[PDB]
Ligand binder design. Structure first.
Ligand SMILES: N[C@H]1[C@@H](OP(=O)(O)O)O[C@H](CO[C@@H]2O[C@H](CO)[C@@H](OP(=O)(O)O)[C@H](O)[C@H]2N)[C@@H](O)[C@@H]1O
Lengths: 226, 214
């Protein structure tokens, strides 16, 4: 029901700027306070900023780490939340989540909590430049074959920043797939993905990985061949 | 500011177990203590608010207790779908602060990995590089060792290994091992094998190919 769709995340250099957006739907936006919450990779959650409703004159509050650098705002007519981020620093690198505040305190208590969360938009503050990945297929060699199943893959090499998305057969073949978390090797990331299918249905029948790296506007498909 | 501490950063439990996750605040927070679940894919939802109130739609096996500075989340009768990281958060005074998180692994029966090996691609070779890749799939427990043998000799330089998160449906893990060489290096050897050693077997699980037959 409640949807909070963040966008605007990307690579930016130190001291740079970036504006995030969040498109809300499925609730009466203008009666709720809204927040941004962030999560530095491998770390815990950190509350960033709050903006209250129009009935509270859109009062805003900020964590001390972002106070005076970040500006939270909203457009009730478009049900949008925004975070303008200026003078960015390395330690602002994080997934940024749009969050709806708990509702009526007379029912839910005065204490603050965060009732609905978006999926997040990733912000990377780094001196390193955008680099598209090299994508390579992974098919079995001629030597040997199992009768029951076969495993195929795609290797995604030497990109920056995170992240990429790999899908198999336009999403069709799903959760037979494993996604291997990306590793940073010498300033650049590498990850891989695998799919397992019945051996009869391949190669008679096509299997394709689509690799998206939004940060460099790249999308590469590899049809897997013996 | 109010510092929130979850002294256990990770634990492992079986299906049906009681799981207790503790949170300590640096000052009294007047019961304004909330718990969140973050699934391995990053999806966050609130479980419990105001110490013990259950969020509508959250299963009753989640409960909370405590007061003052000390609080606890209990998961009774642990279920498969409860693999996640659990965070506490005080809502008493700004800035609103979170604990560092407690990661929950769910046990399952030991499982041997399914191994697959893959030669480098034509495309990569034309670029002057060579990555050999090994997948170890659907194994448990998480600890596992992968060795690369090139013409019988162990190779460690150029190896990178990545483990999946625990699988939400069957609690197994998977890992990829990637050996990246220059095309020159690749070409001067024939036999490439990856050997998986895991507690489920006294001898390694092995997959191999020969460059001149590929
Ligand atoms: N039934 C009320 C309830 O709806 P619910 O969320 O349970 O569906 O809460 C609604 C929202 O209430 C307002 O919540 C605001 C915070 O998000 C709060 O502002 P502050 O916390 O910043 O002071 C405001 O006072 C609440 N009225 C409510 O509209 C529904 O009537």
């Amino acid at each position: 029901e409640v949807q909070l769709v963040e966008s605007g995340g990307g690579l930016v250099q130190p001291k740079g700027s970036l504006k995030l957006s969040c498109a809300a739907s499925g609730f009466t936006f203008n009666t709720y306070a809204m927040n941004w919450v962030r999560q530095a990779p491998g770390k815990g959650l950190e509350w960033v900023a709050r903006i209250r409703s129009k009935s509270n004159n859109y009062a805003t509050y900020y964590a001390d780490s972002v106070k005076d650098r970040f500006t939270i705002s909203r457009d009730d007519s478009q049900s949008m939340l925004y975070l303008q981020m200026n003078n960015l620093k390395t330690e602002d690198t994080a997934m940024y989540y749009c969050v709806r505040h708990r509702g009526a305190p007379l029912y839910y208590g005065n204490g603050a909590w965060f009732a609905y969360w978006g999926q997040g938009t990733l912000v990377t503050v780094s001196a390193a430049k955008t680099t598209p990945p090299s994508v390579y297929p992974l098919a079995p060699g001629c030597g040997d074959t199992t009768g029951s199943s076969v495993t195929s893959g795609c290797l995604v090499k030497g990109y920056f920043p995170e992240s990429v998305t790999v899908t198999w057969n336009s999403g069709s073949l799903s959760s037979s797939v494993h996604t291997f978390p990306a590793l940073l090797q010498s300033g650049l990331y590498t990850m891989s993905s695998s799919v397992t299918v019945p051996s009869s249905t391949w190669p008679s029948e096509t299997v394709t990985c689509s690799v998206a790296h939004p940060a460099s506007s790249t999308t590469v498909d590899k049809k897997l061949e013996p | 500011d109010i510092q929130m501490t979850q002294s256990t950063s990770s634990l492992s439990a079986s299906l049906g177990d009681r799981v207790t996750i503790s949170c300590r605040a640096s000052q009294d927070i007047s019961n304004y203590l909330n718990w969140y679940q973050q699934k391995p894919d990053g999806t966050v939802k609130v479980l419990i608010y105001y110490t013990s109130r259950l969020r509508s739609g959250v299963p009753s096996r989640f409960s909370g207790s405590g007061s003052g500075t000390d609080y606890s989340l209990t998961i009774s009768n642990l279920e498969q779908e409860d693999i996640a990281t659990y965070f506490c958060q005080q809502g008493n005074t700004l800035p609103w602060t979170f604990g560092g998180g407690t990661k929950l692994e769910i046990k399952r029966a030991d499982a041997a990995p399914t191994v697959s090996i893959f030669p480098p691609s034509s495309e990569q070779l034309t670029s002057g590089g060579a990555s050999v890749v090994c997948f170890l799939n659907n194994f448990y427990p998480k600890d596992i060792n992968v060795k690369w043998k090139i013409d019988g000799s162990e190779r460690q330089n150029g190896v990178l290994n990545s483990w999946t998160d625990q699988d939400s449906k069957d609690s197994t893990y998977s890992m990829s091992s990637t050996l990246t060489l220059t095309k020159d290096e690749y070409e001067r050897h024939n036999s490439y094998t990856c050997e998986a050693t895991h507690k489920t077997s006294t001898s390694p699980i092995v997959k191999s190919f020969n460059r001149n037959e590929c």
